[PDB]
Every structure is written in C-alpha cells, then in structure tokens.
C-alpha cells in the first residue's frame, strides 16, 4: 500500500536530501510475439542496456530513438526484478 | 545474473511484442537530511506521484521541472 510524503524546506538553499533515478522495465510481453517465443525476457524485468547503451536515467523518448537506431535488430540486457 | 537478449525482426513493420515503462525510484537518501527526518520514505521506494502528478513514464528532467514549480514544498506518493 502507497505512502504520502510531505517535505517542507526551512531555507531557500536547503536540499531535500533525495537522489532520484529512473529505470525502464518490461511492462508487458505480447502473446506469441518475437519476445515471447524467444523466452529470455520476462514481465517485470528491468532493462539495464539497449544496444550497448545503459538505460538508467534515460527517458522513454530517448530509449525510443535508441531502439529505432538499429532497424530489424534489438539487443538488450535485462535483469529479473 | 543479468541476461543478454537479441531480437531480430523479419520486417520493419513487425513488432517485437514489448511494452516498456519507466519508474522513478529513491536511489539514496542523504544522512540526517530533511527527507530522512521528516519522512516515511526509504531507499528503493518507487515514486508513484509528485505534487499529484503520476510519475510513471516521466523523465527525470520533467520531474525536476515539476518539483521546482512548488518551491519549498514537496508532496510525494511512494511504494515499497
């Protein structure tokens, strides 16, 4: 179950003390798809790399261009979550 | 242990059959910081919302802009 958090600064230049980061994950695998028949990728997997590039902190939009680079071929590194 | 995968299409029109989403997570909390004191927030938590805006699929750069729109106050919804 979720949790609400409320942080209020005491001065303009005080930090929150928070280091945020993003990960791309495999949300859904289409039935009988290329990815499905291959067997190596599973739903929930986190994507460490796409076409040799690390995808941590990468926007979904930038990942799109990273995938579109290599027509017909997609390399990835995934990890069970 | 991380697994390597290579998918090869047979036409540029064909799909791989993959739906991807991004999630913003709490990577590290600074010792004795405002967040470590005034929060029930822990390292590894996923951020679901910032200032009422769902953060799923939001890039870090857009979250930065959203966080600064409310100078001084930060509201979040997180999950273990």
């Amino acid at each position: 179950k979720p949790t609400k958090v409320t942080l209020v600064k005491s001065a303009k230049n005080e930090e929150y003390g928070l280091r945020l980061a993003s990960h791309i994950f495999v949300k859904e695998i289409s039935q009988d798809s290329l990815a499905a028949r291959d067997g190596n990728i599973q739903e929930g997997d986190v994507v460490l790399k796409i076409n040799g590039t690390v995808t941590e902190n990468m926007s979904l939009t930038d990942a799109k261009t990273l995938i579109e680079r290599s027509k017909g071929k997609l390399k990835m590194v995934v990890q069970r979550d | 242990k991380p697994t390597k995968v290579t998918l090869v299409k047979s036409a540029k029109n064909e799909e791989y059959g993959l739906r991807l989403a991004s999630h913003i997570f709490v990577k590290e909390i600074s010792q004795d910081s405002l967040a470590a004191r005034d929060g029930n927030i822990q390292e590894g938590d996923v951020v679901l919302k910032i200032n009422g805006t769902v953060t799923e699929n939001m890039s870090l750069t857009d979250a930065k802009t959203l966080i600064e729109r409310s100078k001084g106050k930060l509201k979040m919804v997180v999950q273990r």
Binding site: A21 | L60, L74
Partner: peptide, 9 residues
Amino acid sequence: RPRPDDLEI
C-alpha cells in the same frame, strides 16, 4: 551507483 544524470534535490 552515483550517476551524473541522477536527480539530486
């Protein structure tokens, strides 16, 4: 792993 592109607030 601290990255330069992490969001520190």
